[PDB]
Symmetry: C2
Subunit: 107 residues, 2 copies
């Protein structure tokens, strides 16, 4: 069960690195290394294990539906299917940053 601010941080970082043409495995590594929360490092490294293991990012992410909801994984799947993963992650970073904002407006 992931905090909306923590998902928004991971997704912005990942979108930035993937857009900068880091290989996916390296991008997931950089997001795991840069995390302040051990639980977030582990999560990103676990997703990376699956991608290195041969799974797509969506399938990898799909292993953690408490972190990565169905809509988010299907968005990733489609970007991978089209060769536009970087566009889809940039879109998801905006989306996730809106949910973080809604959660701070109340609490």
């Amino acid at each position: 069960m992931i905090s909306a601010s923590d998902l928004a941080l991971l997704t912005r970082q990942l979108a930035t690195l993937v857009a900068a043409a880091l290989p996916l495995e390296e991008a997931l590594d950089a997001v795991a290394k840069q995390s302040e929360k051990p639980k977030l490092s582990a999560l990103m490294a676990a997703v990376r294990a699956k991608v290195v293991e041969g799974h797509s990012l969506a399938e990898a992410m799909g292993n953690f539906p408490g972190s990565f909801e169905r809509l988010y994984c299907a968005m990733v799947a489609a970007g991978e299917a089209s060769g536009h993963l970087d566009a889809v992650l940039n879109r998801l970073a905006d989306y996730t940053e809106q949910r973080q904002q809604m959660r701070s407006r109340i609490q």
Copy 2:
């Protein structure tokens, strides 16, 4: 540039510098990923000064309409200490905090 623009660019820049991209590749990458030609141009201009041999802090310093004195002094200091990566992460938190205040008010 706006508060939300500065927040985005600082977060992007922190993420890339932390991933060990050379500063000139990090600035390029952030200029490429911007949807606003004014954001891209600013970042290209900062990069120009940095390729001309200036510090990031001096480079940013030429645009006091975007990079406040405190922002620059933090960058200068991180450059001095060999910890620009840590300084940009802190500025990325600061600029996000600021942005989400102007957002609580914005609606």
